[PDB]
Design a protein around this ligand. Structure first.
Ligand SMILES: CC(C)n1c(Nc2ccccc2F)nc2cnc(Oc3c(F)cccc3F)nc21
Length: 337
């Protein structure tokens, strides 16, 4: 066991290995707090996240386990993965804190609206990297479900990694089919969000700034138009069918209009990402093969993930069971070279 030191940072004790120096708060959430630090082993800067109250409840405990399992699996250039995982606990019985370590990027995509705007080449590069990361995640049968600019960590080289949770509205970037319920959807819900993000990078404006879930649907249909019979027939919920139809009727807009100026290949890709019908939306793999990315696409370097076991998601276990499972995963961690 390495030597650990303690430090108070904004009202909580951080207890970390001496290896991590110059802890500097980046920010917080409901699920945890993150400090930048210097890793003396590598001479690289890292992000250290201290989970907030990991075994407060079965929902905290299961989320803690899910986060550790996910982060241990992700091994891709465009997805945040794990450099280290530690606890000051020397046994199961004293295990109440979990810390996770990743490479520090320095900013997120949303705090790149500082830039004033991006050239088409920069949009191509950033969206290419998101889609490359999503290909990999999606291939493990994982769906992000909350992709937004604050979930995309970007360094000064414009390299990008997908985060599970960022600092800091979800609904602005959420797909219409999961706006009211979770009955009929797939991994392309993340593609919708990528479309929304791409639009905002090209435009400097949030595409669909809805004030609530029904206003959100309203703004969405104003762009893509009210659905025809072929989509309405797949909506189970009489409540959802009625909101969609009760707008009035709206023509699909000309994306060449709303995105004039843009590379028409960008516009064409957007029209394929922002398809209302979940079953017809382009996948991450299909999107990477689009001509918009001809400068970056290489099918030989767009890997898929090893098989990921998410059977635990179906399980209803006791806080102590989630906690033991989490502990095993901490003990079994092997750092990358
Ligand atoms: C701040 C937080 C969202 N965060 C995480 N979280 C995290 C997730 C899983 C395991 C360990 C972790 F520390 N890793 C980060 C890497 N890089 C950056 O960069 C920044 C930035 F420095 C300031 C603001 C926005 C960012 F994305 N943020 C990271």
């Amino acid at each position: 066991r390495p030597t650990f030191y303690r430090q108070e940072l904004n009202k909580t004790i951080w207890e970390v290995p001496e290896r991590y120096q110059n802890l500097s708060p980046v920010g917080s959430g409901a699920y945890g707090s993150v400090c930048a630090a210097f890793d003396t082993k590598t001479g690289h800067r890292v992000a250290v996240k201290k989970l907030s109250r990991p075994f407060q409840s079965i929902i905290h405990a299961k989320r803690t386990y899910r986060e550790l399992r996910l982060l241990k699996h992700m091994k891709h250039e465009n997805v945040i993965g794990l450099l280290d995982v530690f606890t000051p606990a020397r046994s199961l019985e004293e295990f109440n804190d979990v810390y996770l370590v990743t490479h520090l990027m320095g900013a997120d995509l949303n705090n790149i609206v500082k830039c004033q705007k991006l050239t088409d080449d920069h949009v191509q590069f950033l969206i290419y990297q998101i889609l490359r990361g999503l290909k990999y995640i999606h291939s493990a049968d994982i769906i992000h479900r909350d992709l937004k600019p604050s979930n995309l960590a970007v360094n000064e080289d414009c390299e990008l990694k997908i985060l599970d949770f960022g600092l800091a509205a979800t609904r602005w970037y959420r797909a219409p089919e999961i706006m009211l319920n979770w009955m009929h959807y797939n991994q392309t819900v993340d593609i919708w969000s990528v479309g929304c993000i791409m639009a905002e990078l090209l435009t400097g404006r949030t595409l669909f700034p809805g004030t609530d879930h029904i206003d959100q649907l309203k703004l969405i249909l104003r762009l893509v138009g009210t659905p025809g019979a072929e989509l309405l027939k797949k909506i189970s919920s009489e409540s959802a069918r009625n909101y969609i139809q009760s707008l009035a009727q709206m023509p699909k807009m000309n994306f060449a209009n709303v995105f004039i100026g843009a590379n028409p290949l960008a516009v064409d890709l957007l029209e394929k990402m922002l398809v209302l019908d979940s079953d017809k939306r382009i996948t991450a793999a299909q999107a990477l093969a689009h001509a918009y990315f001809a400068q970056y696409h290489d099918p030989d370097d767009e890997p898929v993930a090893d098989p990921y076991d998410q059977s635990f998601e179906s399980r209803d276990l006791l806080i102590d069971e989630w906690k033991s499972l989490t502990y095993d995963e901490v003990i079994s961690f092997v750092p990358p070279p």
